[PDB]
């Protein structure tokens, strides 16, 4: 009932993990719409490198396309195909 | 090759998800040690409620105990059993 140092280290270390990302972050120049859902699950670089002079950055990336409700409030609503960035390989760099 | 509105909505919605949490956040009063790994995978409340006057907060919580390397720098190192908070049920509240 205690997680062992090498499991932890292994699970925590820099990798692509499923991460919930606010859409407003990905599209910060959106004056026009609110979004539903407001956040989307994307594979993103998460974890630690365990070395202050390193950071976990993606190497290889691929676009994924999703159906998002775009509400122009008090005006209307529709469903829009939205492209989001995904990370396929992460690795520790300076 | 396009994620369908109801999948997205379903996957994005408020739930316990595996999240990498910096240890320094959980123990912000730590003057003495650096930690290895510096971040740990914990089940935490993530997602959206899709309703500006709501937020995704945990209901039921449980402590998990992990083995972390604690380095007092230029002094020494050891392995320490560290308790971290985990969320078992999340739900949307005001």
């Amino acid at each position, epitope marked *: 009932e205690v997680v062992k140092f090498m499991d932890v280290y292994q699970r925590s270390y820099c990798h692509p993990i499923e991460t919930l990302v606010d859409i407003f972050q990905e599209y910060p120049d959106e004056i026009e719409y*609110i979004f*539903k*859902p407001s956040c989307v699950p994307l594979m993103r670089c998460g974890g630690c490198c365990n070395d202050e002079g390193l950071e976990c950055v993606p190497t290889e990336e691929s676009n994924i396309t999703m*159906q998002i*409700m775009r*509400i*122009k*409030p*008090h*005006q*209307g*609503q*529709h*469903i*829009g*195909e939205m492209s989001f960035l995904q990370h396929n390989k992460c690795e520790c760099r300076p | 090759e396009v994620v369908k*509105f109801m999948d997205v*909505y379903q996957r994005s919605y408020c739930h316990p998800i595996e999240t990498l949490v910096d240890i320094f956040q959980e123990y912000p009063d730590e003057i003495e040690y650096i930690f290895k790994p510096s971040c740990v995978p914990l089940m935490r409340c993530g997602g959206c*409620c*899709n*309703d*500006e*006057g*709501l937020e995704c907060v945990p209901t039921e919580e449980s402590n998990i105990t992990m083995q972390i390397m604690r380095i007092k720098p230029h002094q020494g190192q050891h392995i320490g059993e560290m308790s971290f908070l985990q969320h078992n049920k999340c739900e949307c509240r005001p």
Partner: antibody
Amino acid sequence: EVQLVESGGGLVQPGGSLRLSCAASGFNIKDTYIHWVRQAPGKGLEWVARIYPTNGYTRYADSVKGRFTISADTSKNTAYLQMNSLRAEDTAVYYCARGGAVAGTGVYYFDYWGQGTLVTVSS
Amino acid sequence: DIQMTQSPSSLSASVGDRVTITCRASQDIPRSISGYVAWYQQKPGKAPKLLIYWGSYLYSGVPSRFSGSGSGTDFTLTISSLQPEDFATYYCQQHYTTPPTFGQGTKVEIKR
């Protein structure tokens, strides 16, 4: 048990005025858009007006702007349409309808309709 | 302001037939955009009832023989096996913008 019950239709003269009511029940009109939609005899459906009761925001079709006013009294759970300067082309069945809430935001379709009230603009 | 053009204007079909009715938006909307059309059924001297919302979702209590789809400017309501009680006028409605507008209707007669 959602219901919308329109009243106050009837005969009215050209240039006259009429106020329609819509009594809602099984829900709070606070949480929804209320609309009026009309249908001239034997014709299609024409949206006339919309109210967001909390803040009292209104929108209108051009054919009725400046003559019709939509409102809502949240304490009586009742929506109104005040109709002024009526002409024969305003003759129609007038329906109240709601757009419920989904994903914490009003929908822009009409999920419940009352049964309508006939307005006849004639001398 | 979107005008919606509905076709056909009227049709005659037999019980069990598949019926298809279309709605075209007047404005140039591309195929990546969908879910802005609702469809209603109106029987004579009755209020319309909602059948399909957000382009293609079936409204609760509506029989499953009704369905819808579409994208861009082009939407479709299908009745997969026409019943005698499906005698009606059917209307589409856009809510891409305000004012929301209606097509002008398709009158379905049951051929017997």
